[PDB]
Amino acid sequence: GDVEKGKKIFVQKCAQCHTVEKGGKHKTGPNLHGLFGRKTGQAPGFTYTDANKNKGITWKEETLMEYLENPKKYIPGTKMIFAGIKKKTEREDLIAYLKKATNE
């Protein structure tokens, strides 16, 4: 996938809840400002369900594309009332954009 597509796809899918671009409004999900290497939760300005937080994994491309398929498998109490973006390809676009948003 592609960052430019990832912009669009992020804005379609995630905008409704998140805006991970330069301290955007933690509306229904926070700024995931720097995912790759991050342990779960860590949202002082938008305290997590603790569920997310508690899993305490390491977010990287895989774990992300995985959770974004199947967030409930990862975190049963995931407060992300969401479809699960079945299409690996759509998720790649997102991980790509993450790699120039939630990264550098």
Curated annotation (Swiss-Prot):
Keyword line: Acetylation, Apoptosis, Electron transport, Heme, Iron, Metal-binding, Mitochondrion, Phosphoprotein, Respiratory chain, Transport
One GO cellular component term noted in the UniProt record for this chain: cytosol
Modified residues (Phosphotyrosine): Y48, Y97
Domain of life according to the entry: Eukaryota
SUPFAM superfamilies reported for this sequence: Cytochrome c
Molecular function (Gene Ontology), one example: heme binding
PROSITE patterns in alphabetical order: CYTC
Binding site for heme c: C14, C17, H18, M80
GO biological process, one term: mitochondrial electron transport, ubiquinol to cytochrome c
Compartment(s) where it occurs, according to its Swiss-Prot or TrEMBL record: Mitochondrion intermembrane space
Posttranslational modification: Binds 1 heme c group covalently per subunit. Phosphorylation at Tyr-48 and Tyr-97 both reduce by half the turnover in the reaction with cytochrome c oxidase, down-regulating mitochondrial respiration.
Xref: InterPro entries: Cyt_c-like_dom (IPR009056), Cyt_c-like_dom_sf (IPR036909), Cyt_c_1A/1B (IPR002327)
Modified sites of kind N6-acetyllysine: K72, K99
Modified residues (N6-succinyllysine): K55, K72
Pfam family, one: Cytochrom_C
Principal location class: mitochondrion
N-acetylglycine found at: G1
Family recorded in the similarity comment: Belongs to the cytochrome c family.
Further details from the record: Mules and hinnies are heterozygous, having equal amount of horse and donkey cytochromes c.
Function: Electron carrier protein. The oxidized form of the cytochrome c heme group can accept an electron from the heme group of the cytochrome c1 subunit of cytochrome reductase. Cytochrome c then transfers this electron to the cytochrome oxidase complex, the final protein carrier in the mitochondrial electron-transport chain. Plays a role in apoptosis. Suppression of the anti-apoptotic members or activation of the pro-apoptotic members of the Bcl-2 family leads to altered mitochondrial membrane permeability resulting in release of cytochrome c into the cytosol. Binding of cytochrome c to Apaf-1 triggers the activation of caspase-9, which then accelerates apoptosis by activating other caspases.
Entry protein name: Cytochrome c
Organism of origin: Equus caballus
